[PDB]
């Protein structure tokens, strides 16, 4: 048993079988709970679930083939198995909250991609859409250990610690010293000598974040609103160290819409970037151009975080979920459509020891184990 709870926008049934378009309180998902999930991931009006068995299920908007079910137009209102992957044990799905493509990493290190093909983000030397998952041949000889997707580019990292990026080159998000689109996975040579252990990719005019095993956080790409974390707004196409987070013990990095977030081993949350609609959690909607601790969570040991487009979720070590940011569709889980300017306890989960959260563009997920 893993109980799964969902809330937020439900216009395309991206919550997997609830009635109503704005679910304002976390609601038990019997379809998703029945699956025994190890991971839920949220994309643009879409939801993906990876089970202990290693299968993948998807629901929500099917346009551009987000869901990898061989279709391209309508809605999948009930979570449906991506049967193209039924012969593999999938370990993780990577998708951005504002994304229309995704990747899947198997336990034996293979990477499949599917969905919108613009700018080569699927990694098959073309700009073609893929309605069904397709193996990224370029990575077949690398033992990939993690994956990440933005709205317009993608990334993967090997067990030796090398980082690959591909997709839209504009504004330097790929990190290769130019702005050239890569239809193929390309190694970030500037980071050799560092063992990269996570990577996160942003949306639209996007940033990229990387984390090394020594705790170093790097950022590059678009610089608007200070989401690179080094002040001002100048972009770059070469990875640069975010000096402020050195020595902080960062263990998880995420990119929402035009903002960045980091969580540390000791349980503190840092955010920076675009401030509009209170996505940063500092109580105001001003921009923050170097990382700043979310004071609203000081004293709470956060063990897992997730970012949507305009909202964030954080779980304490005691199973409590806090949310902050925009609430046009109920994604805050406070029973209303009122913004959470500061981190706020999510209603309706008491007695559920949540261990993990996930976000899509405008929806939210929490689950136990």
């Amino acid at each position: 048993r893993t109980k799964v709870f969902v809330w937020g926008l439900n216009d395309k049934d991206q919550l997997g079988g609830l009635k109503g378009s704005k679910i304002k309180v976390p609601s038990f998902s019997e379809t998703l709970s029945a699956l025994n999930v190890v991971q839920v991931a949220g994309g643009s009006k879409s939801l993906f679930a990876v089970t202990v068995e290693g299968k993948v299920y998807a629901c929500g908007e099917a346009t551009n083939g987000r869901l990898g079910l061989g279709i391209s137009s309508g809605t999948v209102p009930i979570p449906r198995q991506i049967t193209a992957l039924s012969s593999y044990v999938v370990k993780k799905v990577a998708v951005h909250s504002g994304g229309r493509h995704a990747t899947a990493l198997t336990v034996d290190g293979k990477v499949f991609s599917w969905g919108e093909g613009d700018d080569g983000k699927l990694g098959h030397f073309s700009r073609m859409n893929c309605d069904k998952p397709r193996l990224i041949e370029a990575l077949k000889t690398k033992r990939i250990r993690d994956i990440a997707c933005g709205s317009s580019h993608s990334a993967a990292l090997t067990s030796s610690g090398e980082l690959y990026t591909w997709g839209l080159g504009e504004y330097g998000r790929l990190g290769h010293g130019d702005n050239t689109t890569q239809l193929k996975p390309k190694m970030v040579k500037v980071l050799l000598g560092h063992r990269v252990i996570q990577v996160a990719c942003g949306s639209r005019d996007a940033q990229t974040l990387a984390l090394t095993d020594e705790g170093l956080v790097f950022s590059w790409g678009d610089g608007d609103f200070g989401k690179l974390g080094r002040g001002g707004s100048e972009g770059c196409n070469i990875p640069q160290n975010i000096e402020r987070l050195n020595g902080q013990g960062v263990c998880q990095i995420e990119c929402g819409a035009q903002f960045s977030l980091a969580l540390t081993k000791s349980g503190v949350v840092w955010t920076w970037g675009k401030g509009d609609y209170f996505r940063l959690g500092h109580g105001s909607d001003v921009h923050v151009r170097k990382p700043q601790v979310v004071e609203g969570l000081r004293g709470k040991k956060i063990v897992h975080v997730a970012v949507g487009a305009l909202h964030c979720l954080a779980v304490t070590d005691s199973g409590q979920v806090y949310a902050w940011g925009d609430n046009d569709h109920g994604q805050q889980g406070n029973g209303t459509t009122t913004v959470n300017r500061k981190p706020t306890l999510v209603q309706g989960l008491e007695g559920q020891k949540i261990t993990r959260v996930a976000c899509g563009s405008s929806h939210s997920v929490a689950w136990t184990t």
Binding site: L9, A309, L310, D328
Partner: peptide, 9 residues
Amino acid sequence: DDDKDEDTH
């Protein structure tokens, strides 16, 4: 907000 979803109802 470019990154706000619309509720298609």
